[PDB]
Amino acid sequence: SLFSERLKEIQDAVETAMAAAIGRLPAGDLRDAMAYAAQGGKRLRAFLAIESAAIHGISMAQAMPAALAVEALHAYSLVHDDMPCMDNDDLRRGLPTVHKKWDDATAVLAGDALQTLAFELCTDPVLGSAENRVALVAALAQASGAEGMVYGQALDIAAETAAVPLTLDEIIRLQAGKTGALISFAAQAGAILAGADRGPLTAYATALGLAFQIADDILDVEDAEAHKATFVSLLGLAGAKSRAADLVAEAEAALAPYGEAASTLRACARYVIE
Amino acid sequence: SLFSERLKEIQDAVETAMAAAIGRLPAGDLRDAMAYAAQGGKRLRAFLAIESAAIHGISMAQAMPAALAVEALHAYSLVHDDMPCMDNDDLRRGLPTVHKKWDDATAVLAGDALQTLAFELCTDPVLGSAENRVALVAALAQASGAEGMVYGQALDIAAETAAVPLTLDEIIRLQAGKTGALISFAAQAGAILAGADRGPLTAYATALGLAFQIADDILDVEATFVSLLGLAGAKSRAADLVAEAEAALAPYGEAASTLRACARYVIERD
Numbered sequence: 001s002l003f004s005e006r007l008k009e010i011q012d013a014v015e016t017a018m019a020a021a022i023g024r025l026p027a028g029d030l031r032d033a034m035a036y037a038a039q040g041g042k043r044l045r046a047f048l049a050i051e052s053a054a055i056h057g058i059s060m061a062q063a064m065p066a067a068l069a070v071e072a073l074h075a076y077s078l079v080h081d082d083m084p085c086m087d088n089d090d091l092r093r094g095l096p097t098v099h100k101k102w103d104d105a106t107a108v109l110a111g112d113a114l115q116t117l118a119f120e121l122c123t124d125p126v127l128g129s130a131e132n133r134v135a136l137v138a139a140l141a142q143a144s145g146a147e148g149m150v151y152g153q154a155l156d157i158a159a160e161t162a163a164v165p166l167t168l169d170e171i172i173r174l175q176a177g178k179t180g181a182l183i184s185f186a187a188q189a190g191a192i193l194a195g196a197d198r199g200p201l202t203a204y205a206t207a208l209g210l211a212f213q214i215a216d217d218i219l220d221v222e223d224a225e226a227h228k229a230t231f232v233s234l235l236g237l238a239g240a241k242s243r244a245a246d247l248v249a250e251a252e253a254a255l256a257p258y259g260e261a262a263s264t265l266r267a268c269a270r271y272v273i274e
Numbered sequence: 275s276l277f278s279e280r281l282k283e284i285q286d287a288v289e290t291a292m293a294a295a296i297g298r299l300p301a302g303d304l305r306d307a308m309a310y311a312a313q314g315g316k317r318l319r320a321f322l323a324i325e326s327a328a329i330h331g332i333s334m335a336q337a338m339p340a341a342l343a344v345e346a347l348h349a350y351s352l353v354h355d356d357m358p359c360m361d362n363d364d365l366r367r368g369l370p371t372v373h374k375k376w377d378d379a380t381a382v383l384a385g386d387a388l389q390t391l392a393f394e395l396c397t398d399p400v401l402g403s404a405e406n407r408v409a410l411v412a413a414l415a416q417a418s419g420a421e422g423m424v425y426g427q428a429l430d431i432a433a434e435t436a437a438v439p440l441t442l443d444e445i446i447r448l449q450a451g452k453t454g455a456l457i458s459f460a461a462q463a464g465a466i467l468a469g470a471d472r473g474p475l476t477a478y479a480t481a482l483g484l485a486f487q488i489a490d491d492i493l494d495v496e497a498t499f500v501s502l503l504g505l506a507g508a509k510s511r512a513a514d515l516v517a518e519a520e521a522a523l524a525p526y527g528e529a530a531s532t533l534r535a536c537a538r539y540v541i542e543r544d
Contacts, residue, residue, distance in 0.1 A: 025420040030428040085378035104359035109428050116419030119393045123412040130404040137411055138397040145390030146299040150383050154304040
């Protein structure tokens with residue numbers, strides 16, 4: 001399809017660009033760990049950044065530093081999350097995690113530096129004006145810190161052993177922090193770089209992010225973390241499926257001002273449930 | 275003296291402004307551990323940010339988010355450094371470390387959010403033009419990441435298990451990364467915000483950063499700096515670098531007075 005071919009292209013370009021940006025750093029164990037953690041993945045957040053840019057008439061070359069920013073940040077968070085003090089993961093996508101391949105010290109440092117790299121990438125003159133770049137840093141920061149991604153991780157610790165079982169509102173607030181905020185930055189990145197209205201892409205992302213999580217739960221159905229309240233347990237199998245579809249249709253509809261230009265973005269929404 | 279009063283006023287105002295900045299986040303264990311980590315300390319780096327700005331005719335009000343940015347970044351680094359897998363500290367400034375008071379998970383996360391907050395503070399429009407703000411965050415990213423502070427820390431850890439003890443040339447290059455880079459950002463910050471030449475303040479910071487490091491090793495014995503030079507040699511060497519740092523600021527005339535007083539202060543405790 002257009003979507004699948006466009007995705008493949010973006011994945012190939014991102015792999016190359018990330019390796020080049022990391023290869024610029026001083027050699028050593030730190031850099032090897034950084035490189036290993038930022039390689040592979042579906043690049044869905046890079047996709048969103050590039051496609052939302054394309055919709056505002058911005059080239060992939062002008063958009064690359066923002067796509068790599070959100071991928072670096074995504075990568076940093078997994079490294080920190082795979083640590084024994086947190087999710088305690090030995091393997092990710094069939095492969096050893098950073099803290100296992102190297103050591104815990106390398107994992108905290110590789111993730112720290114990857115965070116730094118993401119913000120540095122946001123200052124790259126290729127992106128365009130200083131005004132737009134400083135709005136991009138601000139938005140990546142809002143998405144990633146103590147009112148965004150990290151906050152959602154803090155809540156997840158309380159949530160996975162909660163006394164009263166988790167309500168729908170709570171697992172929605174969870175989702176919105178853990179994955180929602182960064183998916184939203186990625187989708188808004190295009191508009192940020194064009195200095196354009198961020199409303200439609202925000203609404204598209206809110207709906208898309210939640211749809212992702214709901215679609216994820218359904219796939220798991222079809223210990224503390226394993227027996228947590230999911231959208232399938234709360235809404236039912238059919239209730240979850242119908243909610244996923246509703247949200248995808250809501251995300252597509254948010255992109256109506258863009259006409260046929262939004263094609264790959266609306267196929268991205270459909271992809272999550274299909 | 276008159277420097278003593280400038281340092282305490284800045285310490286007071288950094289304490290307030292940081293509590294207000296962290297106060298604006300959602301409540302919880304995370305916000306508590308962040309605010310705890312970012313409270314206190316001598317505010318050296320914040321002082322360098324504010325005072326190099328004053329040297330360039332920029333008020334404290336306009337400089338504050340850059341001072342908060344160094345401090346938040348510094349705090350983040352301490353929280354992560356204290357963890358069992360790194361330096362393994364149980365106390366700092368008397369009180370228990372973040373990992374000890376809470377746990378390892380909270381250390382990671384409060385560290386992470388503190389780095390994120392540091393970069394968020396660099397975008398505060400109070401700092402002035404977006405051009406200077408973007409140069410500020412590029413500088414902070416340079417000081418802090420895989421070419422700066424983090425790189426230095428990684429080298430320091432790899433040092434801990436080296437086949438040979440390290441040369442004085444290497445332990446200079448190590449701590450230029452580990453502590454020098456962030457002090458360099460802090461001194462240059464005032465010039466960045468005025469769109470001015472950064473060279474003199476950079477040379478100041480390179481001298482001062484090394485001297486600050488040597489004066490800390492002096493504290494311990496009172497391959498490190500005291501072991502490689504002796505207590506006679508290191509007390510002399512740090513006093514040399516202080517002079518160097520004061521000399522680097524000769525272009526500024528007697529406007530360099532507070533920052534020179536600061537350079538002498540980091541060895542005035544010895």
